Structure 1
Amino acid sequence: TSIMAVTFKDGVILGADSRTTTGAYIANRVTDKLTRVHDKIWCCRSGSAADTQAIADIVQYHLELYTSQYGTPSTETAASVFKELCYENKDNLTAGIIVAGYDDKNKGEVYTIPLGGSVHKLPYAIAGSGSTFIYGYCDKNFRENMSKEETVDFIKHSLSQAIKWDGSSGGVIRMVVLTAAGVERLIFYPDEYEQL
């Protein structure tokens, strides 16, 4: 799995590959790893498909119940709910989740939650087996306050390399853009991103 979330001037963009593997067999080549826990709070999932689905479903329930009582939750709040589940059940879970969301007050925010259940607020985050191969590239090429088009290119190029080198990553590159304007889904096919 190759997943990442990147804050930029107008908000935040989530990115992910579409490969699910059972050993070396690709059980699903068109997987959607960008999942919605609230209108403008999404997450990227890596690790166990069952665990991360179960967690995301529980979080979506918690935030739906939060909204009914206290109004729209912050991205920090959503990250905290993910953390609570990942930390307290660390012995039984294999889940690496990146939480990304857009407020109007706080704008674009990214929180990464690795295996232990710790929380880290960052300008951008990378995760999954394929992320190892792009630490160098992403550190050198990331800038703060990029444009939408620049951020899409940054994610497209980054995940392209992660896919190229990681066998557990592949298929299409899915992206989700989170801004004041709304929620936009993007997709990029092999013929496009392989020639980069």
Structure 2
Amino acid sequence: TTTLAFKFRHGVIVAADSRATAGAYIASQTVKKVIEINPYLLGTMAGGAADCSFWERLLARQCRIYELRNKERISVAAASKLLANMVYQYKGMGLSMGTMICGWDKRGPGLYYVDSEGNRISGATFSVGSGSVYAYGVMDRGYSYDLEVEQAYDLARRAIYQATYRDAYSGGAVNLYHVREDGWIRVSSDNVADLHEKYSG
């Protein structure tokens, strides 16, 4: 499990792997770990399959009612706060949730990080997962706020590949989304074995 997210001048980049295991047994290789909440919001899956699947679907149930009652989209800081209060009521009962919230706002970009323990922080760069610590170093060596769009696509695609190389619980495919001002857009989805012929060559 390895996800990352970083914002820059032209929006937010979201990338993740697709491998979900069960002990030492790989269950699948085509797990979509970036949950499409809205046409203007995105959420990740990191730690616990049904825990990140249920509560973000319940958050998407809540943000639609907020749009109908007020004739306006929800802000990014609002949705991350509503998710933090729902999980905090089950503190200590044994949940696992480490997702991220992305989306464009009236204040510009938006990037928050929500734990099951109760940590709600903002920031510019994040990397969540078991192989997350392999992704901080290769990202920060190439990170800049004024990167190009095609340059930012190659940075996140490189960083997932180096994480799936060293980690054993990470592999499959590399998904890649791009959050624009109007809404998010799916970039691509590449296999790791196809990148190995490209990068090592």
Shorter-chain TM-score above 0.5? yes
TM-score, with structure 2 as normaliser: 0.90
Corresponding residue of 2:63: 63
Corresponding residue of 1:159: 160
Contact 2:41 2:184 in 1 (8 A): no
Distance 2:189 2:147 in 1: 20
Q: Cα offset for 1:8?
A: 1.9
Contact 2:76 2:110 in 1 (8 A): yes
Q: Cα offset for 1:115?
A: 3.8
Distance 1:74 1:146 in 2: 26
Corresponding residue of 2:137: 136
Give unpaired runs (5+ residues) of structure 2: none
How many residues of Structure 1 are paired with residues of Structure 2 in the alignment? 195
Distance 2:184 2:116 in 1: 28
Larger Rg: 2
Q: In structure 1, the residue corresponding to 2:46 is in which secondary structure?
A: strand
Q: In structure 1, the residue corresponding to 2:52 is in which secondary structure?
A: helix
Q: Deviations over 1:129-159 (max 9, x none)?
A: 0102222222322211322212211111111
Give unpaired runs (5+ residues) of structure 1: none
**Change in CA separation of 1:172 and 1:58 when aligned onto 2, cut-off 3 Å:** same
Q: Deviations over 1:34-77 (max 9, x none)?
A: 11222111011100101111111111111111111122001111
Distance 1:157 1:78 in 2: 30
Distance 2:156 2:144 in 1: 12
Stretches of 4+ aligned residues off by more than 4 angstroms: none
Q: Cα offset for 1:181?
A: 5.1
2:193 maps to 1:191: yes
Distance 1:119 1:39 in 2: 23
